[PDB]
UniProtKB/Swiss-Prot annotation:
Effect of D364A: Significantly decreased binding of heavy chain (HC) to synaptosomes, whole toxin is significantly less neurotoxic. Dramatically decreased HC binding, whole toxin is dramatically less neurotoxic
Full protein stretch here: 862 to 1276 of 1276
Cell compartments where the protein resides: Secreted
Organism taxonomic ancestry: Viruses, Duplodnaviria, Heunggongvirae, Uroviricota, Caudoviricetes
Listed name of the protein: Botulinum neurotoxin D heavy chain
Domain notes: Has 3 functional domains; the translocation domain (TD) and the receptor-binding domain (RBD) which is further subdivided into N- and C-terminal domains (N-RBD and C-RBD, also called Hcn and Hcc). The N-terminus of the TD wraps an extended belt around the perimeter of the LC which occludes the catalytic pocket. The belt region may be a pseudosubstrate inhibitor which serves as an intramolecular chaperone for the LC prior to its translocation into the host cytosol.
Region (N-terminus of receptor binding domain (N-RBD), Hcn) residue spans: 2-218
Chain location of the short sequence motif Host ganglioside-binding motif per the record: 377-380
Region (C-terminus of receptor binding domain (C-RBD), Hcc): 219-401
Amino-acid positions noted as binding N-acetyl-beta-neuraminate in the UniProt annotation, renumbered to this chain: T308, D309, K323
Function comment: Responsible for host epithelial cell transcytosis, host nerve cell targeting and translocation of light chain (LC) into eukaryotic host cell cytosol. Composed of 3 subdomains; the translocation domain (TD), and N-terminus and C-terminus of the receptor-binding domain (RBD). The RBD is responsible for the adherence of the toxin to the eukaryotic target cell surface.
Domain of life (superkingdom): Viruses
Amino acid sequence: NSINDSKILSLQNKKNALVDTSGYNAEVRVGDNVQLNTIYTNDFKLSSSGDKIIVNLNNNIAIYENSSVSFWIKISKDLTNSHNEYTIINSIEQNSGWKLCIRNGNIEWILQDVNRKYKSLIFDYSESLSHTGYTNKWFFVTITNNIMGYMKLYINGELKQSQKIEDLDEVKLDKTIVFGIDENIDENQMLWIRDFNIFSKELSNEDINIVYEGQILRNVIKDYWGNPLKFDTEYYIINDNYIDRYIAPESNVLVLVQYPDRSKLYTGNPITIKSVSDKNPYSRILNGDNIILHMLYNSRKYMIIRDTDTIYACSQNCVYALKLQSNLGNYGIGIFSIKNIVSKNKYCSQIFSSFRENTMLLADIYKKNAYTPVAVTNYETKLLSTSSFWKFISRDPGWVE
């Protein structure tokens, strides 16, 4: 493909080292404390004001104008708050070149000439720590530079800025790239980056989306943060429509109780996902996989199941409540399947059941009144209702509360 062929720097993990696999042999030095391949194959973590990754390019890279840079990034909550400014990726020798900075929930791409004049492409990824923002969530970033004099900023394949190289003169580029944060930070101030690639051309919006779609791993279910969802892992399962409500037994039926404190995220009864078929413990959940949900409630685990009887006292558009069952096992009544929803700003999925009648899970109020998760038949019409979207919140080191 023409896109890969353009790669002049590709940071990937091979044996157990982060190396350049572009073929141009750039030198890569990884600090001792730097953690690699913890969530995604080619990821790396940057934290405690020190440990860094140093990339030294070679003469192989015929210098020019047109070029592109892509990578995914996940920034911890404690780090997105700090009003302080942080440089995370630096490629500036004296005062010329580029660097990537984060400042108060904002990611900023800086390009400055020899006169020390810069332009900057900015993006508010946090947007007031909105649970609909990207704090501590993986998002795909792409920067492109061209001859006409335009540098654009893309977030998840969507153009967000674009500015022309005007008051910008000569921009000397050095053979070195430094990844890290030297400024003293908390033990909880951290961030992750994966699939860092440098391109020799100006990727087209279409080209960018092809890379995005390929690196997001479409067949892998994702947790709330964009990390792959895993079997035998604790998750606070929430409905997309009701981010501040937690699943609870309440009255012989599962319901969604309001978070006593909306500012908190980690609230409720942790649910573990088990595979019906035999798969290694904490392996990745893929869409189409059959699963079982165990809810931990008062020192005991229960299997979430679909009620056999309808919500009231059916023939078409039937509504079934969800319940807890003590006897654990591969009971078809508790067997569900899961599938990713394609969406540029939401890591969620749909849950289905093929027990006796094909149903899909959704949350709504029907009936004194209460928000209830239910399984409903003849749901084609609802495949795009956000009420059938579920998110799985894992306790992540990037969000401490």
